[PDB]
Every structure is written in C-alpha cells, then in structure tokens.
Design an enzyme around this catalytic site. Structure first.
Site, short mmCIF file in Angstrom:
data_model
loop_
_atom_site.label_atom_id
_atom_site.label_comp_id
_atom_site.label_asym_id
_atom_site.label_seq_id
_atom_site.Cartn_x
_atom_site.Cartn_y
_atom_site.Cartn_z
N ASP A 1 -0.46 6.11 2.77
CA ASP A 1 -0.89 4.75 2.47
C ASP A 1 -2.39 4.75 2.14
O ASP A 1 -3.18 5.48 2.77
CB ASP A 1 -0.58 3.89 3.69
CG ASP A 1 -0.62 2.40 3.39
OD1 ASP A 1 -0.85 2.04 2.22
OD2 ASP A 1 -0.45 1.62 4.35
N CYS B 1 6.79 0.14 -0.67
CA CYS B 1 6.06 1.07 0.15
C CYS B 1 5.88 0.28 1.45
O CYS B 1 6.87 -0.13 2.04
CB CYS B 1 4.74 1.45 -0.54
SG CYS B 1 4.05 0.19 -1.66
N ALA C 1 3.06 -2.36 1.98
CA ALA C 1 2.64 -3.69 1.53
C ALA C 1 3.29 -4.06 0.19
O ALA C 1 3.34 -5.24 -0.21
CB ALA C 1 1.10 -3.74 1.39
N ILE D 1 2.18 -2.97 -2.81
CA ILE D 1 1.22 -3.14 -3.90
C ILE D 1 0.50 -1.86 -4.34
O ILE D 1 0.34 -1.62 -5.54
CB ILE D 1 0.12 -4.21 -3.57
CG1 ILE D 1 -0.64 -3.83 -2.29
CG2 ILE D 1 0.76 -5.62 -3.44
CD1 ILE D 1 -1.89 -4.68 -2.04
N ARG E 1 0.94 1.95 -3.53
CA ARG E 1 1.71 3.07 -4.02
C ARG E 1 2.74 2.64 -5.05
O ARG E 1 2.99 3.36 -6.03
CB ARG E 1 2.32 3.79 -2.82
CG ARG E 1 1.27 4.51 -2.01
CD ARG E 1 1.77 5.00 -0.66
NE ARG E 1 1.93 3.87 0.26
CZ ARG E 1 2.37 3.97 1.52
NH1 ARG E 1 2.69 5.16 2.03
NH2 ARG E 1 2.48 2.86 2.26
N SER E 2 3.33 1.46 -4.85
CA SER E 2 4.32 0.97 -5.80
C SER E 2 3.66 0.65 -7.15
O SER E 2 4.21 0.92 -8.21
CB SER E 2 4.98 -0.29 -5.24
OG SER E 2 3.99 -1.21 -4.81
N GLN F 1 -3.92 -0.43 -5.35
CA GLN F 1 -4.86 -0.84 -4.33
C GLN F 1 -6.25 -0.24 -4.26
O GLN F 1 -7.22 -0.96 -4.02
CB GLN F 1 -4.19 -0.66 -2.97
CG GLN F 1 -5.03 -1.11 -1.77
CD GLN F 1 -4.25 -0.95 -0.49
OE1 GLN F 1 -3.80 0.15 -0.16
NE2 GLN F 1 -4.07 -2.06 0.23
#
Length: 308
Positions: A209, A239, A241, A243, A245-246, A283
């Site tokens: 993360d 993932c 949150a 936002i 990794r996705s 992120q």
C-alpha cells in the site's frame, strides 16, 4: 484444467506488436528517448503536482450519510455520487465507482472500489452479480505488516459453499500460487434462478500500500493474464482504499491498450480522466512515476525483441 504455467503466461502479449507505426524502429527509439527525457527532467512529478489541484466531480454526499458512513473503510475516501455503483433496485450504497476509459476502438470499463469490510461482503458480491463482472483484480494483500488492508471475502476452504447474501451462494473451487500473485476460481450462484457464474479472482500480492510493485515483471504478467481472461463485464479493481494501486493498474492497462492499437497516450490526461470518476486515483508521486517507468520498460523490451 491445468494449473497456469509460466510458459502459458510468457506467450501472453503484454502489448500487441505491429509491423510498423509509432512503436517500431526509429519511431520506437524516438518514443523511448522522449520518455527517458521526461523522467530525467522530473516532468512526471510536476504533472502529478498539477493533477492534485484538480477539483472534485461532486461532494460525495451519499457515502457521507450516517447510515452509510459505516460502510466506508476510510471516512475520507468516497465515491462521487454521479459515478457510484448502486446496489439493487433500491439503489443501496457501496463504496465503489464506475471508471470508463475510451481506448481507441475499445473501451476499458472498471469498477474501482475499496476492499470489502466484514459488514459489506454481501454488498460486494451483490454488486459483482448485478454488474455482471467475472474478473476481480485485487491489488493488495489482506494484511500488510501490522495493518489490515482488506478482509477476506471468499471461503478459505476449497469446495465449501456459503451464502454471502440471501440469494447468492459462493464457493472457492480452485487456488493457484504464482510468482507475485494468486489466481482463485470461484462460482457464484443465484440459488433462486440456479444460474451459476464462474468468477476469476486475480490477487496481486507483491504491491505494498502507498508503494510501487516489488515485482514489476510479475505485474506485467498479471496484467496480460487479466486481459487474456476477460471476456465481458466490468473488471473489478480494488485494493484497500480503491484509489492508489487500482488507479496505477488502470493507467498501465490503458496505456498498454493504446500502444497495442498504435495510438498516442498522455498519462496526465489519463489520470485526470480517472480522477473525474473516482477521486484520488493514483495516490503517490512514486506510483505516478511508476506508470512512466513501466511503460518505458515495456517499450525497451519491445525494442530488444525487435532486434531479434
């Protein structure tokens, strides 16, 4: 059927190689030179800085109601109202957003959501059934270090079915361990209609993360496998949150698709497009730079094969 083999994976194209175009010969060298130039001058970092200045689509009111607040893993990471994925005819709430990106003559459709909470396991599967998804890309481990990232939302015992909702029965029929990721085959059935669907659950575990993949080659293999098995329906990408990794996964997936059709790509525009559908996609500065680094890497490998 057989377990996934490395050979089977190595033959899967990360990008479709064309006879000529923008990504072959002198033109490919020029693209590589440009990308290296951008990274060398820190342009990606500057682009991200500008993107974090982009205003929200809407205020995410629905996810903030007292009855819904509890359905969010993180109080401040919410789906916009406009692009949220609804649950059932009643429009129940789930922290998930539709993200659609035109990719030449194709359109890549995803549902980016938070990793399900113990109390939203049923909601999650309801969404998967209603949205007709058969591919889930889970880009996180359940726990990382001492931190919970996502609760396991599938049975951990092979073959045992369980009702995740009044209508949906879920079973884990197969689990395979690959380098950097896990492939699980699940069956999801509406016991009322008796319709059974086969869900492919792809779990990339070598991506911490707020970090970048510790195994870039394995992520490329993962992506080529996800692309290969996807037939129809939105691809669920989550993932913790939903936002970071996705978003990085989506950006790379899309750029590779653009390269495959001999089209130009602009990472900033792409991330901006994603961020207007779900706030905060991609992120960190390093995740944004990683999008550039891995595409540059893919292009250098292409060049290496070309000079076959």
């Amino acid at each position: 059927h057989s377990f996934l083999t490395n050979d089977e994976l190595a033959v899967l194209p990360v990008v479709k190689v064309l006879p000529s175009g923008k990504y072959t010969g002198a033109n490919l060298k020029s693209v590589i030179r440009v990308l290296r130039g951008l990274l060398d001058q820190g342009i990606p970092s500057k682009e991200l800085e500008n993107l974090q200045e982009l205003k929200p689509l809407d205020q995410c009111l629905i996810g903030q109601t007292k009855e819904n607040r509890r359905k969010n893993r993180y109080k401040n990471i919410l789906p916009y109202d406009a692009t949220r994925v609804p649950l059932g005819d009643e429009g129940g709430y789930i922290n998930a957003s539709f993200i659609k990106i035109p990719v030449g003559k194709e359109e890549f459709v995803y549902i980016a959501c938070q990793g399900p909470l113990p109390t939203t396991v049923g909601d999650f599967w309801q969404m998967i059934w209603e949205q007709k998804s058969t591919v889930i890309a889970m880009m996180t481990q359940e726990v990382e270090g001492e931190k919970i990232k996502c609760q396991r939302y599938w049975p951990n015992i092979l073959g045992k079915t369980t009702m995740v909702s009044n209508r949906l029965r879920l079973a884990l029929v197969r689990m395979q361990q690959l380098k950097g990721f896990v492939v699980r085959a699940m069956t999801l059935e509406d016991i009322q209609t008796r319709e059974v669907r086969h869900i492919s659950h792809l779990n990339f575990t070598a991506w911490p993360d707020h970090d970048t993949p510790s195994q870039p080659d394995d992520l490329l293999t993962f992506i080529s496998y996800m692309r290969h098995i996807h037939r129809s329906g939105p691809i669920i990408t989550h993932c913790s949150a939903g936002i970071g990794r996705s978003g990085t996964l989506i950006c790379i997936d899309v750029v590779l698709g653009l390269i495959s059709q001999d089209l130009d790509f602009d990472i900033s525009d792409l991330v901006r497009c994603m961020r207007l559908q779900r706030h905060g996609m991609v992120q960190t500065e390093d995740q944004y730079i990683f999008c550039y680094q891995v595409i540059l890497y893919v292009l250098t490998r292409l060049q290496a094969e070309e000079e076959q």
